[PDB]
Design a protein around this ligand. Structure first.
Ligand SMILES: Nc1ncnc2c1ncn2[C@@H]1O[C@H](COP(=O)(O)CP(=O)(O)OP(=O)(O)O)[C@@H](O)[C@H]1O
Lengths: 985, 212, 201
DNA sequence: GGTCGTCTGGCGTGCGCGCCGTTACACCAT
RNA sequence: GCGGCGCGC
DNA sequence: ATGGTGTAAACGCCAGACGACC
């Protein structure tokens, strides 16, 4: 029997508990009582909340009155009321007899003394006071002792948690006292949510007009601030009048934050408003979300958690500090839990109805409060306009054109960023639970959900806690990597950005460089063709200008943070999606980005090169140029030494002289590597030089590499380089040659389509089709992809593209089956199982080998599943869970040997010296992962989760027949992977 | 230039002497989800104001058998009057994305013209006409740029406050004012923009054309 | 009969029909035909060009044109209007779709005279593909002009031309053959298809 | 109500990030 | 989340 | 320049739908 008003009043009482105005809530409660119809909506939870609020400040009489009210009502007193009574009895230091009588009455109802400590959550001070009271009553009562933390005993994760093995964990370079001040700097930056960053645009000369405009802006903003403060005071004065007389009001909510941060937030919202308007509901939702976030951040200063976090972080930094030492080294999470950890309390958001009214109260206060001179009588700034948006009629707030002209005239050189979208200035908090994560004073979700997804977290919270430790440790390890910004590349990029930028290298161009159509004095309407082409040219020019503006809008925001974070050390935390892949939290400036973003980043900590570092640097450079991809490593190294003069020429004088790096696929990373190689060669001892640049190792076609491993295909594994070889194998060339020989044999016997296609089959036509098989590519999409490439080709006759495209799709799909057969068998088996379990009315659920439960969100509009999307999505989502697990196993095994490991998924990055160790660990963990039976355990879990019921056995029989028809494997041996050279090379 | 102003203001061409002797009008404003109307007289009094909210229209299909049975029910409550005033919008066929709204507006306007214009076969004289939106907005100074702003403040001045100023612009009945105030208080939470526009358009019709 | 007729009409009243009028219109002219229960034509006329479809869209002009055309049409118990095939996703067919919907709304509103009193529908919508498949002029969405079928029926025929009126239809038929008129043939074809399918099983 | 074969219309590679915009256009008077 | 674009695996 | 004006009609497949029977 859920009702809106009941939930509204419950939120009201909880907010009054968070704030200090308890007697106002006591007034609304007494007044709601005394109405025959207003009494029925009251609930036991409200009474217990008011009782706890009165108990926390030691008001004995009010608890007696609330107990009298509950006794007059028919509600049964829960154990939380007993805990609140004992808290007050303890703090007031009353006589032992009364508290003993209270415990006797609790025993009369059958409640347990341990239950109040265990069943209901309470604050540390509250539990301490209750313990003191019961100790005063009975001094022999002792809480049960704690236990040593559990350890994972799974087969795949057994060696990580073994104590007997030798370990050598990495340590940071910065001293302890240096690390302590960065915590204070990050705390200061987190306390004030907004961050101001100077823009990288060219400074304009200030004239008299711009100074006049800025003076007018300053005076108007001061008047607006005064008006907003007075309006907020008057609004708070009357809404509170509503609480008297028993009406509900957002007055408890409006006194949550002080007047100053509300006025500043409203002014920032007014500053962020576009020229054309924005929907009213969006403003309401943004205002409600922002004020809730500000309350969550600012409560922690008053509650006193910041001091405890400071002390525990100061003690925790001894493990990561260079000068300090610990008795026994261990993992960061184990050390964080060995010391007393701060208790974290999860918070519940307000209901939507309470959130939606707060946006309107404060979005309608702004329009009335602000006024502007005509430029006499004052004319308002903000207006209500009814308009059309997204094929719908909505309401829109619109500003004054004079405001827009004044803001365009004055050029503000500053930009604004949120605190969550900038990198951290201190090492992040370790991952210990799905509730506690990286950020110091902001909550973060373990899995990224687009909207309204609660089934992921529910499955993450009902698993045993021991299963998630591998994932948590991998995320914590990825969090602790230290970064710094390269400066020479930044200076060159800014030098090209401020002038007209080069667009082939990835730097956008200013809007003034857009092409201009010729202007003719003759009217276009005189001739039909003239006016026909003029409209098309004008529309095309407007469209390309609109496209050009957004790229510079992106590049400015990307390039501001690089200038901001120069000469600083920063960290990047990580999260996950529902399948298991890992992504960084800051979106604007991180790795997993483009060429320019990757060229700026480098490692803060440095390692000596060693006897084999320079060779790996040269091989990485040759890989980045991309000229040689079909050759062994020896020939890449031989090619590297042949072009050293161009490397030195590019390193010494980048933009003047021969420009060799611009011809590469990745020019900026090529230049960043060439600079370091030129530094290393000129040194006296190359083996003693310090390096800060990552080296990349990746493997082509990971999904086929996993499908071949599952089915043990002998012919399939050779193409994807699972078997040992001297020269790497390319699947695309094999597909092209099979298609070519099919065309060659078919052309002789009665064909004309094959006759014209001679010489036009290559890697380019089939590359996208072969790449997209892991996702399901149907025949329709394949024919579209082949048609696009055929149209781009010029020599081919355009009339016969249709039959040729059909022929190519048919022959590539015939060629794929000959090489890959077990892949098709397993894909069909998973498709059939998904189809049947979707027909029964359930979504697909499985468990990864490392213990992470995965569920699929697809669902039609207590809602019916969608069969097609589940069936098409199951096979590509299985392999990605297996790709993530090799990565999270490889990272945890690389940590023990003392390595710095960072990975963009399917690619591995590390220092120059550690490549061999990383390769051996990767191959060993791959062999260990696929040696275990995967398909049989998947079948057993499916037969246990689904088809386990005594009802509808007829539909159960077909599922049992289908699920147990696991395909048989091949004769390929898995131990040969360890000797492979180009697995992830 | 008064004649040219009336040609721009009112698309149907009706003789001036017939407009001088009008006794009552009804203004109709409709949207994707609502329709409303109001009643007025030579000495401006407001006998009726109402809205029809729930219908099963738009969605994805357009069927005449549903439009007819809904419009025939809506018109049943409309009382007799000498003229009916419809609002015309600046939307056109050029807006490719907004074309379903244009379909809805044109179908509803055509059915209103066909049903409400009785005795056309016998006499051949019109009783339904269209009035422009922006021209009405410019007479109340509600136009910033090319865009018309809301007029809820103006009806808040007309009702819930009584400043005569020796020439009030609109009259309300004594007995029915409480229901009007209650309805206006109910509609403040979710803003329906057609109820105000109907009354404003009626006042504009009486001022610009009848009394000129 | 969802596939044939969009408005749901009961089976009892559908079969017991004395006469029916079929209306087919286009972008230049409108034509109708009158046939009673026995397959004998009573009235077959075509209209000249109208002022519509040039530039602006106005409702008064539509009202005057339709009120001029409806007056000449005689009374019948049921009216059948064609349901053509157009897609809202297509961008180049918007004005024709708008004109068709405005004309359909005008005809539905004006013809149902008693609907304000009794509440029954006297206007029906029939799809073109059902007629094209039944009479097999052109299989599928394609449409044969149908002149050869009309020459087969007029000048054992299915439709009978009554005496003393055959000369008028012959005089009209020999004319306008060079002109591109299709509504005259389609109206009669729709009437015969309605009488074949909806009536006499 | 459940079901029960049977003809028809929609759809056709996965996941994760950014920026912009919402009758337009040519002319003419002042 | 309606449209036009860009990026990573 | 702005204000203000005028102008713009190429194939296959499968999850439902359901009328009727049960
Ligand atoms: N695993 C993957 N799945 C889908 N698209 C991918 C992909 N890896 C790369 N791409 C896409 O493929 C393009 C990269 O071109 P390439 O660098 O040639 C891919 P490749 O597999 O490395 O072939 P290559 O080894 O010959 O370079 C980009 O558009 C990128 O988004």
């Amino acid at each position: 029997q859920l009702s809106g008003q009941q939930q509204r009043l419950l939120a009201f009482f909880k907010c009054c508990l968070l704030t200090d105005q308890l007697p106002l809530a006591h007034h609304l409660l007494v007044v709601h009582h005394g109405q025959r119809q207003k009494r029925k909506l009251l609930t036991l939870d409200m009474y217990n909340a008011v009782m706890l609020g009165w108990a926390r400040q030691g008001a004995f009489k009010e608890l007696v009155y609330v107990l009298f009210m509950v006794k007059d009502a028919g509600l049964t007193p829960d154990l939380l009321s007993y805990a609140a009574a004992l808290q007050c009895m303890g703090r007031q230091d009353q006589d032992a007899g009364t508290i003993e009588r209270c415990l006797e009455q609790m025993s009369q109802e059958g409640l347990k003394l341990q239950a109040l400590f265990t069943a209901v959550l309470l604050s540390e001070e509250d539990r301490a006071t209750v313990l003191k009271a019961v100790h005063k009553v009975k001094p022999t009562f002792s809480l049960p002792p704690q236990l040593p933390p559990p350890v994972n005993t799974s087969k795949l994760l057994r060696d990580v948690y073994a104590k007997d093995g030798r370990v050598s964990y990495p340590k940071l370079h910065l001293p302890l006292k240096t690390l302590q001040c960065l915590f204070e700097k990050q705390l200061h930056m987190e306390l004030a949510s907004r961050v101001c960053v100077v823009s990288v645009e060219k400074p304009t000369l200030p004239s008299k007009e711009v100074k006049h405009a800025r003076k007018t802006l300053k005076t108007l903003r001061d008047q607006w601030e005064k008006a907003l403060c007075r309006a907020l005071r008057e609004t708070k004065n009357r809404l509170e009048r509503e609480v008297y007389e028993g009406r509900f009001s957002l007055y408890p909510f409006l006194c949550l934050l002080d007047e100053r941060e509300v006025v500043r937030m409203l002014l920032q919202v007014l500053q962020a408003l576009p020229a054309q308007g924005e929907s009213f509901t969006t403003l309401a939702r943004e205002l409600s979300a922002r004020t809730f976030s500000r309350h969550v951040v600012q409560r922690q200063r008053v509650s006193g958690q910041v001091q405890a976090l400071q002390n525990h972080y100061r003690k925790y930094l001894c493990l990561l500090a260079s000068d300090a030492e610990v008795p026994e080294p261990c993992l960061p999470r184990q050390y964080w839990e060995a010391l007393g950890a701060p208790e974290a309390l999860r918070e519940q958001p307000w209901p939507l109805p309470v959130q939606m009214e707060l946006g309107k109260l404060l979005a309608e206060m702004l329009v009335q409060a602000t006024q502007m001179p005509c430029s006499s009588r004052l004319v308002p700034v903000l207006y209500h306009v009814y308009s059309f948006r997204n094929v719908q009629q909505i309401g829109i707030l619109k500003p004054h054109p004079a405001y827009v002209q004044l803001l365009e005239k004055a050029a503000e050189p500053t930009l604004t960023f949120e605190a969550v979208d900038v990198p951290m200035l201190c090492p992040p908090l370790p991952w210990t639970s799905p509730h506690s994560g990286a950020f110091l004073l902001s909550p973060t979700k373990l899995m990224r959900t687009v909207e309204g997804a609660t089934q992921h977290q529910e499955l993450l919270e009902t698993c045993p806690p021991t299963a998630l430790h591998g994932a948590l440790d991998a995320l914590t390890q990825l969090g602790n990597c230290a970064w710094r910004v390269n400066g020479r590349v930044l200076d060159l990029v800014l030098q090209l950005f401020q002038a007209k930028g080069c667009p082939q290298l990835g730097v956008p161009a200013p809007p003034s460089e857009a092409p201009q159509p010729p202007e003719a004095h003759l009217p276009h309407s005189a001739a039909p063709a003239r006016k026909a082409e003029l409209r098309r040219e004008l529309a095309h020019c407007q469209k390309v200008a609109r496209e050009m503006h957004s790229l510079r809008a992106e590049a400015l925001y990307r390039l501001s943070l690089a200038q901001h974070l120069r000469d600083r050390v920063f960290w990047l935390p990580h999260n996950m999606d529902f399948r298991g892949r890992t992504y960084p939290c800051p979106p604007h400036f991180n790795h997993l980005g483009s060429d320019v973003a990757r060229a700026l980043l480098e490692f803060a900590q440095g390692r000596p090169l060693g006897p084999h570092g320079l060779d790996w640097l040269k091989i990485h450079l040759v890989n980045l140029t991309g000229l040689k991809k079909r050759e062994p490593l020896r020939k890449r190294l031989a090619f590297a030494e042949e072009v050293m003069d161009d490397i030195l020429d590019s390193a010494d004088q980048p933009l003047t002289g021969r420009k060799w790096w611009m011809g590469a696929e990745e020019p900026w990373q090529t230049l960043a590597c060439c600079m370091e190689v030129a530094n290393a060669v000129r040194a006296s001892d190359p083996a003693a030089y310090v390096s800060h640049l990552p080296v990349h190792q990746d493997g082509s076609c990971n999904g086929l590499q996993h499908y071949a491993a599952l089915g043990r295909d002998s012919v399939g594994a050779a193409s994807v380089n699972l078997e040992p070889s001297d020269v790497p194998q390319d699947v695309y060339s094999g597909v092209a040659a099979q298609v070519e020989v099919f065309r060659r044999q078919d052309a002789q016997r009665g064909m004309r389509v094959a006759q014209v296609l001679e010489g036009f089959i290559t890697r380019k036509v089939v590359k996208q089709t072969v790449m997209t098989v892991v996702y399901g590519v149907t025949r329709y999409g394949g024919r579209l992809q082949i048609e696009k490439r055929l149209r781009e080709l010029s020599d081919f006759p355009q009339e016969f593209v249709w039959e040729a495209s059909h022929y190519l799709v048919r022959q590539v799909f015939k060629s794929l089956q000959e090489m890959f057969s077990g892949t098709r068998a397993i894909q069909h088996w998973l498709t059939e199982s998904a189809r049947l379990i979707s027909h029964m009315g359930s979504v697909v659920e499985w468990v990864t080998p490392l213990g992470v439960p995965v569920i699929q969100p697809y669902r039609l509009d207590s809602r019916k599943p969608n069969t097609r999307k589940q069936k098409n999505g199951f096979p590509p989502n299985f392999i990605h869970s297996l790709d993530s697990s090799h990565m999270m196993l490889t990272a945890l095994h690389c940590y023990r040997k003392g390595l710095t490991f960072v990975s963009v998924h399917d690619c591995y990055w590390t220092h120059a010296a550690d490549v061999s160790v990383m390769n051996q660990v990767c191959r060993e963990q791959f062999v260990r992962l696929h040696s275990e039976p995967i398909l049989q355990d998947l079948s057993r879990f499916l037969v246990k989760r689904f088809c386990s019921e005594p009802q509808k056995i007829l539909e159960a029989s077909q599922l049992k027949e289908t699920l147990q028809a696991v395909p048989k494997p091949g004769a390929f041996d898995l131990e040969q992977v360890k000797r492979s050279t180009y697995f992830f090379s | 230039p008064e004649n040219r102003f009336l040609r721009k203001l009112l698309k149907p061409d009706i003789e001036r002497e017939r407009l001088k002797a009008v006794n009552s009008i009804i203004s109709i404003v409709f949207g994707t989800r609502r329709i409303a109307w109001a009643h007025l007289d030579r000495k401006l009094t407001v006998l009726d104001w109402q809205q029809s909210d729930r219908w099963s229209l738009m969605r994805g299909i357009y069927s005449s058998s549903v439009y007819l049975e809904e419009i025939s029910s809506i018109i049943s409550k409309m009382p007799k009057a000498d003229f009916y005033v419809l609002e015309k919008t600046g939307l056109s066929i050029q807006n490719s994305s907004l074309f379903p709204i244009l379909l809805h507006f044109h179908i509803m306007e055509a059915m209103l013209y066909a049903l409400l214009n009785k005795t056309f076969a016998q006499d051949g004289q019109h009783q339904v006409l269209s009035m422009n939106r922006n021209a009405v907005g410019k007479h109340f100074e509600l136009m910033i740029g090319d865009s018309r702003t809301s007029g809820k403040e103006l009806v808040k001045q007309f009702l819930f406050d009584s400043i005569l100023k020796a020439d009030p612009r609109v009259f309300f009945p004594s007995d029915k004012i409480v229901h009007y105030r209650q309805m206006f208080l109910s509609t403040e939470l979710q803003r329906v923009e057609e109820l105000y526009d109907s009354l404003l358009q009626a006042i504009a019709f009486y001022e610009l054309a009848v009394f000129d």
